[PDB]
C-alpha cells in the first residue's frame, strides 16, 4: 500500500497472509487473501498460476506482522488450491483473477474465530456500491514503487470506486477493463495498492454490512495519475465461489 496508514489485524480480521516455501527451505510472502468461511480463503489466481502446487504454500490468519509472529495467530497448510479455469491475460489486465484456498492446520482443523480472526461477508449478486463510494484496501505490499522491501507491519488505505466509463477511457485503461472488474483510486492519486497487495480485500460498507466487494488484481505502476487499481468484481463470481466451496 502506497500512502495510507499502518494497522493491526484487529482492524481487518478476515485478512489472510499467504507465503510460499521454496527449495532452499526459505519462506517468502506471496499475496493477501480474505477468510470467507472457516475453511476457505479467497485470493487472486495470478498469485499462484506459475506455481500451482498446494504443498508449497502456508497461510496465516490473525497475523499483523510480515516476518514475526503475532500473538493469537493461526497457521495452515493448503488442503486445496483452486484456480479459476478461465484465467487469462497474465501479461497485465488479468481476467477471472480469483482463487480459493481450503485451509487445514497440522491438527486437521479450520479457522477458529477470535478477536483477530473473523470472516467477511460476500456481496449479493450484482450488488456493488455506486461509483464515488469510499472503500478500504489492506495488505503487506510495497509502500513505494521503488522499494525493495515489503513493510513489516500491515497497512490499510481508503480508495474511491471509479465508474467503468471513467476507467475505460483510453487515457485510463481502455478496453482492458471489463464488467467483471472494478477500478478504485485516490482523487489525488497519492494512495493505492502496490506489488504484494494482490489477493487482498477491497471492503466497502453496503447497507451497514462490511462486504468483500473486490480482490486486489492489477494496475499499471502504483499511485500514478490515470492508472487506478483494478479489482476482481466479487459480485460477478458468486456461482463460481458457491460451486467450488
Amino acid at each position: 500500500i502506497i500512502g495510507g496508514e499502518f494497522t493491526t489485524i484487529e482492524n481487518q480480521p478476515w485478512f489472510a497472509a499467504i507465503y510460499r516455501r521454496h527449495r532452499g527451505g526459505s519462506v517468502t510472502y506471496v499475496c493477501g487473501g480474505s477468510l470467507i468461511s472457516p475453511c476457505w480463503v479467497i485470493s487472486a489466481t495470478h498469485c499462484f498460476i506459475d506455481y500451482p502446487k498446494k504443498e508449497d504454500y502456508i497461510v496465516y490468519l490473525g497475523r499483523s506482522r510480515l516476518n514475526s509472529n503475532t500473538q493469537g495467530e493461526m497457521k495452515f497448510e493448503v488442503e486445496n488450491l483452486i484456480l479459476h479455469k478461465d484465467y487469462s491475460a497474465d501479461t497485465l489486465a488479468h481476467h477471472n483473477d480469483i482463487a480459493l484456498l481450503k485451509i487445514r492446520s497440522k491438527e486437521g482443523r479450520c479457522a477458529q474465530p477470535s478477536r483477530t480472526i473473523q470472516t467477511i461477508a460476500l456481496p449479493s449478486m450484482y450488488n456493488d456500491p455506486q461509483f464515488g463510494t469510499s472503500c478500504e484496501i489492506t495488505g503487506f505490499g510495497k509502500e513505494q514503487s521503488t522499494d525493495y522491501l515489503y513493510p513489516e507491519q500491515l497497512k490499510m488505505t481508503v480508495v474511491k470506486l471509479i465508474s467503468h466509463r471513467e476507467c475505460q477511457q483510453p487515457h485510463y485503461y481502455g478496453s482492458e477493463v471489463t464488467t467483471k472488474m472494478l477500478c478504485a483510486a485516490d482523487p489525488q492519486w497519492k494512495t493505492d495498492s502496490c506489488q504484494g497487495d494482490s489477493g487482498g480485500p477491497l471492503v466497502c460498507s453496503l447497507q451497514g454490512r462490511m462486504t468483500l466487494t473486490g480482490i486486489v488484481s492489477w494496475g499499471r505502476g502504483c499511485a500514478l495519475k490515470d492508472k487506478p487499481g483494478v479489482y476482481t468484481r466479487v459480485s460477478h463470481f458468486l456461482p463460481w465461489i458457491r460451486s467450488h466451496t
Binding site: 510460499r20 506471496v30 499475496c31 487472486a44 495470478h46 498469485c47 499462484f48 506459475d50 506455481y51 497474465d90 501479461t91 497485465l92 488479468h94 483473477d97 505490499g141 495498492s193 502496490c194 506489488q195 504484494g196 497487495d197 494482490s198 489477493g199 486486489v216 488484481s217 492489477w218 494496475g219 499499471r220 505502476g221 502504483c222 487499481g229 483494478v230
Partner: peptide, 13 residues
C-alpha cells in the same frame, strides 16, 4: 511476461 503490480510469485516476468 507479467507487467504492472499484479505479478507476484511469477517465474519471469
Amino acid at each position: 511476461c507479467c507487467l504492472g503490480r499484479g505479478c507476484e510469485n511469477h517465474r519471469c516476468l
